[PDB]
Amino acid sequence: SGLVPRGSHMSTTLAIVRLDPGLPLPSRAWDGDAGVDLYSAEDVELAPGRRALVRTGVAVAVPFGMVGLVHPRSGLATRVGLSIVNSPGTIDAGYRGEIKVALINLDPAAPIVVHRGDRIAQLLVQRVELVELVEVSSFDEAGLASTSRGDGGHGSSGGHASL
Amino acid sequence: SGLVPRGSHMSTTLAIVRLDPGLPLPSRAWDGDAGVDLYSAEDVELAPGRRALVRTGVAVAVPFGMVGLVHPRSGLATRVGLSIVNSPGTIDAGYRGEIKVALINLDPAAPIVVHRGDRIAQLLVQRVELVELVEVSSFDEAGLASTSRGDGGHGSSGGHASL
Amino acid sequence: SGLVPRGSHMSTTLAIVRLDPGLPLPSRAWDGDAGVDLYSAEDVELAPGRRALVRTGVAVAVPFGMVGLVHPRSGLATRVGLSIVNSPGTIDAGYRGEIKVALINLDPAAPIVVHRGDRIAQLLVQRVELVELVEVSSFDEAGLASTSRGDGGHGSSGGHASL
Ligand SMILES: O=c1ccn([C@H]2C[C@H](O)[C@@H](COP(=O)(O)NP(=O)(O)OP(=O)(O)O)O2)c(=O)[nH]1
Ligand SMILES: O=c1ccn([C@H]2C[C@H](O)[C@@H](COP(=O)(O)NP(=O)(O)OP(=O)(O)O)O2)c(=O)[nH]1
Ligand SMILES: O=c1ccn([C@H]2C[C@H](O)[C@@H](COP(=O)(O)NP(=O)(O)OP(=O)(O)O)O2)c(=O)[nH]1
Ligand SMILES: [Mg+2]
Ligand SMILES: [Mg+2]
Ligand SMILES: [Mg+2]
């Protein structure tokens, strides 16, 4: 266990505080999984269309040059219509507060009951480009070549009757 | 074609099985596009507020150290209110099942009809940090410096009358 | 200021055009923040359940090999139920049009008023794998080893009463 394998030499460490020590540390369900599952610290009942800001019982220190991303779980999304209002939740490198999850019930009729200790979201960590904006008067002025896509967006490639 | 250009030497391959061989391979609409468009294998009609778990007809092997991400298309989102309940859908490196898309109709009044062969989502592949949690009693105890953001979140920087 | 610190040597530049020069350049709220906040160029009022495609007053040139990602802000999400229909919005490297934000009001009862100059979303820039699909008849045929997760998905790991 204690030996870092050569193919894991460069894997990143994430400092975590269990603000609620009664919950397990977040973990990957299976080897290779993109995220660690976040627990609810709280019981909450969401009627259709209602949202709540739910405590996870953890704080993390995302490294500088990275971002933490809070994603919904697919099973709850399909089974009961559970989603996250601000998905993907964007955890900044400087944030030292508790991670909170903005759960919302997108089912039209059935309430969702979350219990303390349920796994209600997943946390990924990725590098992010901390970009330096360069203001230009036009892309042409910036010596950028014309692109194939150009200003095409919002369904310009087709693929559905409404587009 | 067959020659990998020097600037593409390190581009990653993604093994894909067309579980439904009647659909085209997912493709980028234009050069440089972030994602390949996923097809619906199925006809489905979503009344306002309803969701479905839609088959794409594909399975992929996301490489270890990466994640597949299922995003909504912008044109359908604006034009008809189509969204994805668990967006961004998180495809794990170990997953060998069919990719499924949790479509939802967020329009209040008009149903959305999806036909087999429509492009209903897009799949991105990115590296992900497979983090090693390091539990600490406090960030200070971990020798982390105080940050500018501190525990500020959830609108702490302002920028709207409600914040 | 003008000196790039050694730890920022490789930070990426992003060309930006202020199509609406009356708005500030997007900025990070705090050092290390993952995204730059996008402004609304427009006044818009969203009744419950309504969406709009809102102009930000900017165009960017995301570098080839990268993607721009439009995420909701957490404070507005919780406080007033503001979300983005296609979140995370996927800005392609070839796109040279105006960035637009598909705001939606997920509150059941209270309208959301956005004013020109409000910060209504955040833009991240990340690398993306421009994948080369390799079609195979089965993962076994491709010499891929069996995985722990296998075809498990959509709540297969449990963690809620509904799963
Ligand atoms: O939030 C967004 C998302 C996309 N866009 C623009 C830039 C992007 O490159 C372009 C296409 O985005 P999508 O591929 O996500 N939407 P869709 O597939 O419907 O459009 P197209 O057919 O043009 O690819 O639309 C925005 O302005 N805001
Ligand atoms: O899902 C989330 C998203 C954010 N947060 C916290 C951590 C993040 O660094 C902080 C700010 O997130 P956003 O920038 O996405 N929201 P907003 O811009 O409204 O807040 P602020 O004004 O503080 O930047 O809120 C969560 O706890 N959960
Ligand atoms: O949009 C998606 C998201 C996930 N999936 C599949 C692949 C992924 O590896 C698997 C699990 O995804 P999540 O971890 O996001 N959902 P959940 O935690 O509910 O499932 P599990 O308990 O299996 O991890 O479900 C899809 O087919 N489409
Ligand atoms: Mg999972
Ligand atoms: Mg597209
Ligand atoms: Mg912010």
Residue A161 lies in a domain: no
Contact present, A37 and C159 (Cβ < 8 Å)? yes
Task: Give the 3-state secondary structure of residue B102.
Answer: strand
- Token pair for residue A99? 């991670």
Residue A162 lies in a domain: no
Residue A145 lies in a domain: no
Residue C135 lies in a domain: no
Residue of chain C whose alpha carbon sits nearest to that of A69: C34
Distance CA(C132)–CA(B14), nearest Å, equals: 6
Collect all residues with Cβ–Cβ distance below 8 Å to B19 and sequence separation of at least 6: B41, B55, B57, B58, B59, B98
Cα distances (angstroms) measured from residue C17 to each of A148, C60, C123: 19, 6, 15
For the residues of C63-82, what is the DSSP string, one character each? PTTEEEEEE--HHHHHHH-E
CB pairs < 8 Å spanning A and C: 189
Residue B92 CA, ligand 3 centroid: distance in Å: 7
**Chain C residues touching residue A43 (CB < 8 angstroms):** none
Phi/psi zone of residue B79: left (φ > 0), alpha (ψ -120 to 50 degrees), beta? alpha
Residue C57 lies in a domain: yes
Choose among C57, C83, C79: nearest CA to C70. Answer: C83
Torsion B49-B83-B23-A157 (CA) sign: positive
Cα distances (angstroms) measured from residue B92 to each of B19, B35, B61: 18, 16, 9
- Domain of residue B58 covers 1-128
Report which ligand 1 atom has the smallest distance to the Cα of C92: 9
Distance CA(B56)–CA(A1), nearest Å, equals: 39
Q: What is the DSSP letter of A80?
A: H
Whether B159 sits inside 8 A of C89 (CB atoms) is no
Contact present, C155 and C163 (Cβ < 8 Å)? yes
Distance CA(A90)–CA(C33), nearest Å, equals: 9
Phi/psi zone of residue A74: left (φ > 0), alpha (ψ -120 to 50 degrees), beta? alpha
Give residue A160's Cα distance to chain centre.
Answer: 29
Whether B86 sits inside 8 A of A71 (CB atoms) is yes
Contact present, B20 and B57 (Cβ < 8 Å)? yes
Residue B109 lies in a domain: yes
Choose among C55, C69, C60: nearest CA to C22. Answer: C55
Distance CA(B125)–CA(B98), nearest Å, equals: 16
CATH number of the domain that B63 lies in? 2.70.40.10
Cβ neighbourhood burial of C156 (10 Å; 0-12, 13-18, 19+): middle
Three-class secondary structure assignment of C101-144: EEEEECCCCCCEEECCCCEEEEEEEEECCCCEEEECCCCCCCCC
Q: Which helix (H) or strand (E) holds A54?
A: strand A51-55
Domain count, chain A: 1
Residue C92 CA, ligand 1 centroid: distance in Å: 7
Distance CA(C83)–CA(B155), nearest Å, equals: 14
- Token pair for residue B62? 């996301």
Our answer on whether the CB atom of A138 is closer than 6 Å to any ligand 1 atom is no
Our answer on whether the CB atom of A157 is closer than 6 Å to any ligand 1 atom is yes
- Name the one residue in this structure whose structure tokens are 């008009």: B110
- Token pair for residue A25? 């540390």
Please give the torsion angle defined by the CA atoms of residues C162, C81, B76 and A83, in that order, rounded to the nearest 10 degrees.
-20
Q: What is the DSSP letter of C6?
A: G
Neighbouring CB atoms inside 10 A of A44's CB total 19
Strands A89-91 and C132-135, bridge-based pairing: unpaired
Which residues on adjacent β-strands are paired with residue B66? B127
Residue B35 lies in a domain: yes
Our answer on whether the CB atom of B29 is closer than 6 Å to any ligand 1 atom is yes
**Resolution of the structure, angstroms:** 1.5
Is any Cβ of chain C less than 8 angstroms from the Cβ of B119? no
Cβ neighbourhood burial of A48 (10 Å; 0-12, 13-18, 19+): middle
Residue B120 lies in a domain: yes
- Name the one residue in this structure whose structure tokens are 């794990």: B92
**What is the amino acid identity at position C127?**
R
Collect all residues with Cβ–Cβ distance below 8 Å to A131 and sequence separation of at least 6: C11, C12, C13, C14, C36, C125
Neighbouring CB atoms inside 10 A of A162's CB total 16
